[PDB]
Coordinates of C-alpha atoms and ligand atoms in Angstrom, one line a residue:
Chain A
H1 CA 88.1 109.3 120.4
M2 CA 88.8 106.7 123.0
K3 CA 90.8 106.7 126.3
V4 CA 93.7 104.3 126.5
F5 CA 95.5 103.3 129.7
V6 CA 99.2 102.7 129.3
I7 CA 101.1 100.9 132.0
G8 CA 104.9 101.6 132.2
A9 CA 106.6 104.9 131.4
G10 CA 109.8 103.4 130.0
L11 CA 110.8 103.7 126.3
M12 CA 108.2 101.4 124.9
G13 CA 105.3 102.7 127.1
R14 CA 106.3 106.3 126.4
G15 CA 106.4 105.5 122.6
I16 CA 103.0 103.8 122.7
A17 CA 101.5 106.8 124.5
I18 CA 102.9 109.1 121.8
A19 CA 101.5 106.9 119.0
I20 CA 98.1 106.8 120.6
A21 CA 97.9 110.4 121.6
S22 CA 97.8 111.4 117.9
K23 CA 94.1 110.3 117.9
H24 CA 93.1 109.5 121.5
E25 CA 93.4 110.4 125.1
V26 CA 96.0 108.6 127.1
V27 CA 96.6 107.9 130.8
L28 CA 100.3 106.9 131.3
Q29 CA 100.9 105.2 134.6
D30 CA 104.1 104.2 136.4
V31 CA 104.9 103.6 140.0
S32 CA 107.9 105.9 139.5
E33 CA 107.2 109.7 139.4
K34 CA 110.8 110.2 138.1
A35 CA 110.0 107.9 135.2
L36 CA 106.8 109.9 134.5
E37 CA 108.8 113.2 134.6
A38 CA 111.4 111.8 132.2
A39 CA 108.6 110.6 129.9
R40 CA 106.9 114.0 129.9
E41 CA 110.0 115.8 128.7
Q42 CA 110.4 113.3 125.8
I43 CA 106.8 113.7 124.6
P44 CA 106.0 116.2 121.8
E45 CA 104.6 119.3 123.4
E46 CA 101.5 119.3 121.2
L47 CA 100.5 115.9 122.6
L48 CA 100.8 116.8 126.3
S49 CA 97.2 118.1 126.4
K50 CA 96.0 114.5 125.5
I51 CA 98.2 112.6 128.1
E52 CA 97.6 112.3 131.9
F53 CA 100.6 111.1 133.9
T54 CA 99.8 109.2 137.1
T55 CA 101.1 106.7 139.6
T56 CA 97.7 105.1 140.3
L57 CA 95.0 103.0 138.6
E58 CA 91.7 104.8 139.3
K59 CA 91.3 105.9 135.6
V60 CA 91.6 102.2 134.4
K61 CA 87.8 101.8 134.7
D62 CA 87.3 104.8 132.5
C63 CA 89.5 103.5 129.7
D64 CA 88.5 101.6 126.5
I65 CA 91.7 99.6 126.1
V66 CA 94.7 98.9 128.4
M67 CA 98.2 98.5 127.0
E68 CA 100.8 97.1 129.4
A69 CA 104.5 97.7 128.7
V70 CA 106.3 96.8 132.0
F71 CA 109.5 94.8 132.5
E72 CA 109.9 91.6 130.3
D73 CA 109.3 89.0 133.0
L74 CA 106.3 86.6 133.3
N75 CA 105.5 87.2 137.0
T76 CA 105.8 91.0 136.8
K77 CA 103.4 91.1 133.8
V78 CA 101.0 88.6 135.4
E79 CA 100.9 90.7 138.6
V80 CA 100.1 94.0 136.9
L81 CA 97.6 92.4 134.5
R82 CA 95.8 90.5 137.4
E83 CA 95.4 93.9 139.2
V84 CA 94.0 95.7 136.1
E85 CA 91.6 92.9 135.2
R86 CA 89.7 93.4 138.4
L87 CA 89.1 97.1 137.5
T88 CA 87.9 96.8 134.0
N89 CA 86.5 94.5 131.4
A90 CA 88.3 96.3 128.6
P91 CA 90.7 94.5 126.3
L92 CA 94.1 94.1 127.9
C93 CA 97.1 94.2 125.6
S94 CA 100.6 93.2 126.7
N95 CA 103.6 94.6 124.7
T96 CA 105.5 91.4 125.0
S97 CA 108.8 91.0 123.2
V98 CA 109.2 87.2 123.7
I99 CA 107.4 86.2 126.9
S100 CA 104.7 83.8 125.7
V101 CA 101.1 85.2 125.6
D102 CA 99.7 81.8 126.4
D103 CA 101.9 81.6 129.6
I104 CA 100.5 85.0 130.6
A105 CA 96.9 84.2 129.7
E106 CA 96.8 81.0 131.6
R107 CA 97.5 83.0 134.8
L108 CA 94.7 85.5 134.3
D109 CA 91.2 85.3 135.6
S110 CA 89.6 86.5 132.3
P111 CA 91.9 85.7 129.4
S112 CA 89.3 85.9 126.7
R113 CA 90.0 89.7 126.5
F114 CA 93.8 89.5 126.8
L115 CA 96.2 89.5 123.9
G116 CA 99.7 90.5 123.0
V117 CA 100.2 93.7 121.0
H118 CA 103.8 93.9 119.7
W119 CA 104.8 97.4 118.7
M120 CA 108.1 98.1 116.8
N121 CA 110.7 100.6 117.9
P122 CA 109.8 103.5 118.0
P123 CA 106.0 102.7 118.3
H124 CA 105.1 106.1 117.0
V125 CA 107.2 105.8 113.9
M126 CA 107.3 102.2 112.7
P127 CA 104.0 101.2 110.9
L128 CA 103.8 97.5 111.8
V129 CA 102.0 96.3 114.9
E130 CA 101.5 92.6 115.5
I131 CA 98.6 91.2 117.5
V132 CA 99.6 88.0 119.1
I133 CA 96.7 85.9 120.4
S134 CA 96.6 83.2 123.0
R135 CA 94.4 80.1 122.8
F136 CA 92.0 81.9 125.0
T137 CA 91.6 85.2 123.2
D138 CA 88.2 85.7 121.7
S139 CA 87.5 87.0 118.2
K140 CA 85.6 90.2 119.4
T141 CA 88.7 91.3 121.3
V142 CA 90.9 90.8 118.3
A143 CA 88.6 92.7 115.9
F144 CA 88.2 95.6 118.4
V145 CA 92.0 95.9 118.9
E146 CA 92.7 95.4 115.2
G147 CA 90.2 98.1 114.3
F148 CA 91.7 100.5 116.9
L149 CA 95.2 100.0 115.6
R150 CA 94.2 100.2 111.9
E151 CA 92.3 103.5 112.5
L152 CA 95.4 104.8 114.2
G153 CA 97.2 104.3 110.8
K154 CA 99.1 101.1 111.8
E155 CA 99.6 98.1 109.5
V156 CA 98.3 95.2 111.6
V157 CA 99.1 91.5 111.3
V158 CA 97.3 89.0 113.6
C159 CA 99.5 86.1 114.7
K160 CA 98.7 83.0 116.8
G161 CA 100.8 82.3 119.8
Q162 CA 104.1 83.8 118.5
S163 CA 105.2 86.9 116.7
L164 CA 105.9 86.4 112.9
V165 CA 108.6 89.0 113.0
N166 CA 110.4 87.2 115.9
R167 CA 110.1 84.0 113.9
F168 CA 111.6 85.5 110.7
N169 CA 114.3 87.3 112.7
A170 CA 115.3 84.0 114.4
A171 CA 115.3 82.1 111.1
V172 CA 117.5 84.7 109.4
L173 CA 119.8 85.0 112.5
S174 CA 120.2 81.2 112.8
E175 CA 121.4 81.1 109.1
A176 CA 123.7 84.1 109.6
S177 CA 125.2 82.3 112.7
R178 CA 126.0 79.3 110.5
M179 CA 127.7 81.7 108.0
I180 CA 129.6 83.4 110.9
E181 CA 130.9 80.1 112.2
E182 CA 132.0 79.1 108.7
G183 CA 134.1 82.3 108.3
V184 CA 131.8 84.7 106.5
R185 CA 132.4 88.3 107.5
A186 CA 129.5 89.9 109.3
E187 CA 129.7 92.9 106.8
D188 CA 129.1 90.4 104.0
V189 CA 126.2 88.7 105.6
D190 CA 124.7 92.2 105.9
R191 CA 125.7 93.4 102.4
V192 CA 123.6 90.6 100.7
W193 CA 120.6 92.1 102.5
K194 CA 121.4 95.8 102.3
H195 CA 122.2 95.7 98.5
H196 CA 119.7 93.0 97.5
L197 CA 117.4 90.9 99.6
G198 CA 116.2 93.7 101.8
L199 CA 115.1 95.6 98.7
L200 CA 113.2 92.7 97.2
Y201 CA 111.5 91.8 100.4
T202 CA 110.7 95.4 101.1
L203 CA 108.9 95.9 97.8
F204 CA 107.5 92.4 97.1
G205 CA 107.9 90.3 100.3
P206 CA 109.6 86.9 100.1
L207 CA 106.4 85.2 98.6
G208 CA 105.6 88.0 96.1
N209 CA 109.3 87.8 95.1
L210 CA 108.8 84.0 94.5
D211 CA 106.1 84.8 91.9
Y212 CA 108.6 86.7 89.8
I213 CA 111.3 84.0 90.3
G214 CA 108.7 81.5 89.2
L215 CA 107.1 78.9 91.5
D216 CA 108.1 76.1 89.1
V217 CA 111.6 77.4 89.0
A218 CA 111.7 77.6 92.7
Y219 CA 110.3 74.2 93.3
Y220 CA 112.8 72.4 91.0
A221 CA 115.7 74.7 92.1
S222 CA 115.0 74.0 95.8
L223 CA 114.5 70.3 95.0
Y224 CA 118.0 70.2 93.3
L225 CA 119.5 72.0 96.3
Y226 CA 117.8 69.6 98.7
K227 CA 119.0 66.6 96.7
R228 CA 122.5 68.0 96.4
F229 CA 123.3 69.4 99.9
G230 CA 120.7 68.6 101.5
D231 CA 119.9 71.0 104.2
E232 CA 116.3 70.8 105.5
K233 CA 115.7 74.6 104.5
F234 CA 116.0 73.4 100.9
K235 CA 113.2 70.9 101.3
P236 CA 110.5 71.7 98.7
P237 CA 107.1 72.7 100.3
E238 CA 103.9 70.9 99.6
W239 CA 101.8 74.1 99.1
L240 CA 104.2 74.8 96.2
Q241 CA 103.5 71.5 94.5
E242 CA 99.7 72.1 94.4
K243 CA 100.4 75.4 92.7
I244 CA 102.5 73.8 89.9
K245 CA 99.9 71.1 89.3
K246 CA 97.4 74.0 88.8
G247 CA 99.7 75.9 86.4
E248 CA 99.8 78.8 88.9
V249 CA 103.5 79.2 88.4
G250 CA 103.7 83.0 89.0
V251 CA 103.9 86.3 87.1
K252 CA 104.5 84.5 83.8
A253 CA 101.2 82.7 84.2
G254 CA 99.5 85.8 85.6
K255 CA 98.9 83.9 88.8
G256 CA 101.0 82.3 91.5
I257 CA 100.7 83.2 95.1
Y258 CA 99.2 86.5 93.8
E259 CA 97.6 87.6 90.5
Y260 CA 99.3 89.9 88.0
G261 CA 98.6 92.1 85.0
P262 CA 100.7 92.3 81.8
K263 CA 103.1 95.1 83.0
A264 CA 104.2 93.3 86.2
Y265 CA 107.9 92.7 85.2
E266 CA 108.3 96.3 83.9
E267 CA 106.7 97.7 87.1
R268 CA 109.0 95.6 89.2
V269 CA 112.1 97.0 87.6
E270 CA 110.7 100.6 87.7
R271 CA 110.1 100.2 91.5
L272 CA 113.5 98.7 92.1
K273 CA 115.3 101.5 90.1
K274 CA 113.4 104.1 92.1
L275 CA 114.4 102.5 95.4
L276 CA 118.0 102.1 94.4
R277 CA 118.2 105.8 93.3
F278 CA 116.7 106.8 96.7
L279 CA 119.2 104.7 98.6
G280 CA 122.1 105.9 96.4
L281 CA 122.8 102.3 95.3
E282 CA 122.3 102.9 91.5
Chain B
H1 CA 138.9 98.6 79.0
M2 CA 138.8 94.8 78.7
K3 CA 137.0 92.5 76.3
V4 CA 134.5 90.0 77.9
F5 CA 133.1 87.0 76.2
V6 CA 129.5 86.2 77.1
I7 CA 128.0 82.8 76.2
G8 CA 124.3 82.7 75.9
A9 CA 122.0 85.4 74.5
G10 CA 119.0 84.6 76.8
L11 CA 117.7 87.1 79.4
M12 CA 120.6 86.7 81.8
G13 CA 123.4 86.7 79.1
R14 CA 121.8 89.7 77.4
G15 CA 121.6 91.5 80.8
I16 CA 125.3 90.7 81.7
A17 CA 126.4 92.0 78.2
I18 CA 124.4 95.3 78.9
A19 CA 126.0 95.6 82.4
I20 CA 129.5 95.0 81.1
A21 CA 129.2 97.1 77.9
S22 CA 128.9 100.2 80.1
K23 CA 132.7 100.0 80.6
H24 CA 134.1 97.3 78.4
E25 CA 133.8 95.6 75.0
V26 CA 131.7 92.5 74.8
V27 CA 131.4 89.6 72.5
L28 CA 127.9 88.0 72.9
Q29 CA 127.7 84.4 71.6
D30 CA 124.8 82.0 71.0
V31 CA 124.4 79.1 68.7
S32 CA 121.0 80.7 67.7
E33 CA 121.1 83.7 65.3
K34 CA 117.5 84.3 66.2
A35 CA 118.4 84.7 69.9
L36 CA 121.2 87.1 68.9
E37 CA 118.7 89.2 66.9
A38 CA 116.2 89.3 69.7
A39 CA 119.1 90.3 72.1
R40 CA 120.2 93.1 69.8
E41 CA 116.8 94.7 69.7
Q42 CA 116.6 94.6 73.6
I43 CA 120.1 96.3 74.0
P44 CA 120.3 100.1 74.5
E45 CA 121.3 101.7 71.3
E46 CA 124.3 103.6 72.7
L47 CA 125.8 100.3 73.8
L48 CA 125.6 98.5 70.5
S49 CA 128.9 99.9 69.4
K50 CA 130.6 98.0 72.2
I51 CA 128.9 94.5 71.6
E52 CA 129.8 92.0 68.8
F53 CA 127.1 89.4 68.2
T54 CA 128.4 86.0 67.0
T55 CA 127.7 82.3 66.8
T56 CA 131.3 81.2 67.0
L57 CA 134.2 81.1 69.6
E58 CA 137.1 82.6 67.7
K59 CA 137.1 85.8 69.8
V60 CA 137.4 83.8 73.1
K61 CA 141.2 83.8 73.0
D62 CA 141.1 87.6 72.6
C63 CA 139.0 88.1 75.8
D64 CA 140.1 88.8 79.3
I65 CA 137.2 87.1 81.1
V66 CA 134.5 84.6 79.9
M67 CA 131.0 84.7 81.4
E68 CA 128.8 81.7 80.8
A69 CA 125.0 82.0 81.1
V70 CA 123.6 79.0 79.3
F71 CA 120.7 76.6 80.3
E72 CA 120.8 75.6 84.0
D73 CA 121.9 72.0 83.6
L74 CA 125.2 70.4 84.8
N75 CA 126.2 68.6 81.5
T76 CA 125.3 71.6 79.3
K77 CA 127.4 74.0 81.4
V78 CA 130.3 71.5 81.6
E79 CA 130.2 71.0 77.8
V80 CA 130.4 74.7 77.0
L81 CA 133.0 75.4 79.6
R82 CA 135.2 72.4 78.6
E83 CA 135.2 73.9 75.0
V84 CA 136.1 77.4 76.1
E85 CA 138.9 76.3 78.5
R86 CA 140.9 74.9 75.6
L87 CA 140.8 78.3 73.8
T88 CA 141.9 80.5 76.7
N89 CA 143.5 80.7 80.1
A90 CA 141.2 83.6 81.1
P91 CA 139.0 83.3 84.2
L92 CA 135.8 81.4 83.4
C93 CA 132.7 82.5 85.2
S94 CA 129.4 80.5 85.2
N95 CA 126.2 82.5 86.1
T96 CA 124.8 79.6 88.0
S97 CA 121.5 79.9 89.9
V98 CA 121.7 76.7 91.9
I99 CA 123.9 74.2 90.0
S100 CA 126.9 73.5 92.3
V101 CA 130.1 75.2 91.2
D102 CA 132.1 72.3 92.8
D103 CA 130.2 69.8 90.6
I104 CA 131.0 71.9 87.5
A105 CA 134.6 72.5 88.6
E106 CA 135.4 68.9 89.1
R107 CA 134.5 68.1 85.5
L108 CA 136.9 70.8 84.0
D109 CA 140.5 70.4 83.0
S110 CA 141.7 73.6 84.6
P111 CA 139.3 74.5 87.5
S112 CA 141.8 76.8 89.3
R113 CA 140.5 79.7 87.1
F114 CA 136.8 78.7 87.2
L115 CA 134.3 80.2 89.5
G116 CA 130.6 81.1 89.8
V117 CA 129.4 84.7 89.3
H118 CA 125.8 85.1 90.4
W119 CA 124.2 88.2 88.9
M120 CA 120.8 89.4 90.1
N121 CA 117.9 90.2 87.8
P122 CA 118.3 92.4 85.8
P123 CA 122.2 92.2 85.9
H124 CA 122.5 95.8 84.7
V125 CA 120.2 97.2 87.3
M126 CA 120.7 95.3 90.6
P127 CA 124.0 96.2 92.4
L128 CA 124.8 92.8 94.1
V129 CA 126.9 90.2 92.4
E130 CA 128.1 87.2 94.3
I131 CA 131.2 85.3 93.4
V132 CA 130.8 81.7 94.4
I133 CA 134.1 79.8 94.6
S134 CA 134.7 76.1 94.3
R135 CA 137.4 74.2 96.4
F136 CA 139.6 74.5 93.3
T137 CA 139.4 78.2 92.6
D138 CA 142.6 80.1 93.2
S139 CA 142.9 83.4 95.0
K140 CA 144.3 85.3 92.0
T141 CA 141.2 84.4 89.9
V142 CA 138.9 85.6 92.7
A143 CA 140.7 88.9 93.1
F144 CA 140.8 89.6 89.4
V145 CA 137.1 88.9 89.0
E146 CA 136.2 90.8 92.2
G147 CA 138.2 93.9 91.0
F148 CA 136.6 93.7 87.6
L149 CA 133.1 93.6 89.1
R150 CA 133.9 96.3 91.7
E151 CA 135.2 98.6 89.0
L152 CA 132.0 98.1 87.1
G153 CA 130.2 99.6 90.1
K154 CA 128.8 96.3 91.5
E155 CA 128.7 95.4 95.2
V156 CA 130.6 92.2 95.4
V157 CA 130.3 89.4 98.0
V158 CA 132.6 86.3 97.7
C159 CA 131.0 83.1 98.9
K160 CA 132.4 79.5 99.3
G161 CA 130.5 76.8 97.5
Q162 CA 127.0 78.2 97.8
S163 CA 125.3 81.5 97.3
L164 CA 124.5 83.5 100.5
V165 CA 121.5 85.0 98.9
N166 CA 120.1 81.5 97.9
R167 CA 120.8 80.4 101.5
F168 CA 118.9 83.3 103.1
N169 CA 116.0 83.0 100.6
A170 CA 115.7 79.3 101.4
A171 CA 115.8 79.9 105.1
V172 CA 113.1 82.6 104.9
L173 CA 111.0 80.5 102.5
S174 CA 111.2 77.5 104.7
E175 CA 109.9 79.5 107.7
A176 CA 107.2 81.1 105.5
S177 CA 106.1 77.6 104.4
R178 CA 105.6 76.6 108.0
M179 CA 103.5 79.7 108.5
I180 CA 101.5 78.9 105.3
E181 CA 100.8 75.3 106.5
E182 CA 99.7 76.7 109.9
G183 CA 97.1 79.0 108.2
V184 CA 98.9 82.3 108.0
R185 CA 97.8 84.2 104.9
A186 CA 100.5 84.8 102.3
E187 CA 99.7 88.5 102.3
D188 CA 100.5 88.6 106.1
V189 CA 103.7 86.8 105.7
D190 CA 104.7 89.4 103.1
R191 CA 103.3 92.4 105.1
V192 CA 105.7 91.7 108.1
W193 CA 108.5 92.2 105.6
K194 CA 107.1 95.0 103.4
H195 CA 106.2 97.1 106.4
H196 CA 109.0 96.2 108.8
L197 CA 111.7 93.6 108.4
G198 CA 112.6 94.5 104.9
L199 CA 113.2 98.1 105.9
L200 CA 115.4 97.2 108.8
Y201 CA 117.4 94.6 106.9
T202 CA 117.7 97.1 103.9
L203 CA 119.2 99.9 106.1
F204 CA 121.1 97.9 108.8
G205 CA 121.2 94.3 107.7
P206 CA 120.1 91.5 110.2
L207 CA 123.4 91.7 112.2
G208 CA 123.6 95.5 112.3
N209 CA 119.9 95.5 113.4
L210 CA 120.9 93.1 116.2
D211 CA 123.4 95.7 117.6
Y212 CA 120.5 98.1 118.1
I213 CA 118.3 95.4 119.6
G214 CA 121.2 94.6 121.9
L215 CA 123.3 91.5 121.7
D216 CA 122.6 90.7 125.4
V217 CA 118.9 91.3 124.9
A218 CA 119.0 89.0 121.8
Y219 CA 120.9 86.2 123.6
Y220 CA 118.6 86.0 126.6
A221 CA 115.5 86.5 124.4
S222 CA 116.5 83.8 122.0
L223 CA 117.5 81.6 125.0
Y224 CA 114.0 82.1 126.5
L225 CA 112.4 81.3 123.2
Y226 CA 114.6 78.2 122.8
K227 CA 113.8 77.0 126.4
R228 CA 110.0 77.7 125.8
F229 CA 109.2 76.4 122.3
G230 CA 112.0 75.2 121.5
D231 CA 112.6 75.4 117.8
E232 CA 116.3 74.9 116.7
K233 CA 116.2 78.5 115.0
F234 CA 115.9 79.9 118.6
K235 CA 119.1 78.1 119.7
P236 CA 121.5 80.9 121.1
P237 CA 124.7 81.1 119.0
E238 CA 128.2 80.7 120.5
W239 CA 129.6 83.8 118.7
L240 CA 127.0 85.8 120.6
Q241 CA 128.1 84.5 124.0
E242 CA 131.8 85.6 123.5
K243 CA 130.5 89.1 122.7
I244 CA 128.5 89.4 125.9
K245 CA 131.4 88.1 128.0
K246 CA 133.4 91.0 126.4
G247 CA 130.7 93.6 127.2
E248 CA 130.4 94.1 123.4
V249 CA 126.6 94.2 123.7
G250 CA 125.8 96.6 120.8
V251 CA 125.0 100.3 120.1
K252 CA 124.5 101.0 123.8
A253 CA 128.1 99.9 124.6
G254 CA 129.4 101.6 121.4
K255 CA 130.4 98.1 120.1
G256 CA 128.8 94.9 119.2
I257 CA 129.1 93.3 115.8
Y258 CA 130.0 96.8 114.6
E259 CA 131.3 100.0 116.3
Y260 CA 129.0 103.1 116.9
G261 CA 129.2 106.8 117.8
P262 CA 127.0 108.7 120.1
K263 CA 124.2 109.7 117.6
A264 CA 123.6 106.1 116.4
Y265 CA 120.0 105.7 117.7
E266 CA 119.0 109.2 116.5
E267 CA 120.5 108.4 113.0
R268 CA 118.7 105.1 112.9
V269 CA 115.3 106.8 113.4
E270 CA 116.1 109.6 110.9
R271 CA 117.0 107.0 108.2
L272 CA 113.9 104.9 108.9
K273 CA 111.7 108.0 108.7
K274 CA 113.2 109.0 105.4
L275 CA 112.7 105.5 103.9
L276 CA 109.1 105.3 105.3
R277 CA 108.3 108.7 103.7
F278 CA 109.8 107.6 100.4
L279 CA 107.8 104.3 100.4
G280 CA 104.6 106.2 101.5
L281 CA 104.3 104.1 104.7
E282 CA 104.6 107.0 107.2
Ligands
CL1 CL1 95.7 102.3 142.5
CL2 CL1 133.8 78.0 67.0

């Protein structure tokens, strides 16, 4: 059982404190006592015995990890982090939506133990947490924070410099924007996800899904699309071509991006049928 | 109850025949009797009373709609479609993965009643079907095929020239390829979908999800990312800026891309918790 200092009693700070208090003690700090009171009344009653609410920083030196979730502004984050870094040598973790971790890190005195920890909303519900490292972050700090988050029951992905989730959301939104400008209804953009792509990417991911499509199929299909249209997004990737030269063409060969057993196709359909039934889309 | 002619007794043709035979009579044609025999033994026994297997085209003139699912090659598709167009004035529907519907249509004698119908795999399980229209396709042909598919229980999206699903898959795969080349493990690319983005896009779609993020939040966040990094995918869309000028900033304003009632945030969390529990990711 560790003690975690959480800076900022807004929605995200409050949620992080709830997620952590399941297993650890928390100190939740905010300069506003009104924010602390509002937070307290939103926290499950059983967890209140594990959370100290405060306006000051004296408990920072007693904590094993600091999580910062203040306003999304470079100078504000730098200011709070520079204050806390003098009080402790613990890992310092900014919940940063889009502010660059490298831009923050380069303004700290001791950036080797600073990194980004990107929680999803609500932090205590959603399983994914991304660790976003700067060029300064050391390996020990990553492994410590990764272990902490994993032991909390989170699914952890470590990213360099930028969030992978933000990257994928922007790539999808950029394409959706093209469709919107072309005249595609928003509802239809969403329906191709809600009734198809979201299901496949949920169960298999986009790369796992590719194995079932067939890596050979995908390379020649994307290549045709590139030669026909020829949007950059269709351009056939180099990593894919090494796979096809190896005969690692997917589920049909028992190996593509991943390795498969004989019942893979049958299991795919079983899992999709189950998800469709659950969602009421059967 | 209509009669539908399906050309090609491979996996996709066989699956389309199974999907349709739930409600309609089917003639399933292939030049190979061995393919027809293999198809017959994969078709549910209760449906066999609704499906005629044949090697010839005499029943095409009796059918209300023709679905073509032959080898993915322009000249092969054109050849079969040119043959069938002489025998009937019914809508002609090519299950085309990536071959351009416009390239096919321009080689037909009567392209006003030709369109693409893109079934997912397996056709009889997966609810989404895309209609992909050429510059020639008339509105009557679309509405007829859309109605047929809807009444079959499919979720139909009508697309101009290219599949929206193919577009989104290529956009996501292009970004994943960048990540792969950078050193991101495939498993991690997939985990950000399987444990997060796939769930959000399944339940809300990428645009509906944006409403909860906040359209104002997204515009300024993407704008920062564009000014900082500045990948084209971060470039802030024009449609978004009109929304923010209108105060249609999302769920918080009761209106963004879509319109919302007071319990929207609470209902979002309830639906995500239910899906997490079902998937065993809670
Ligand atoms: Cl203090
Ligand atoms: Cl004939």
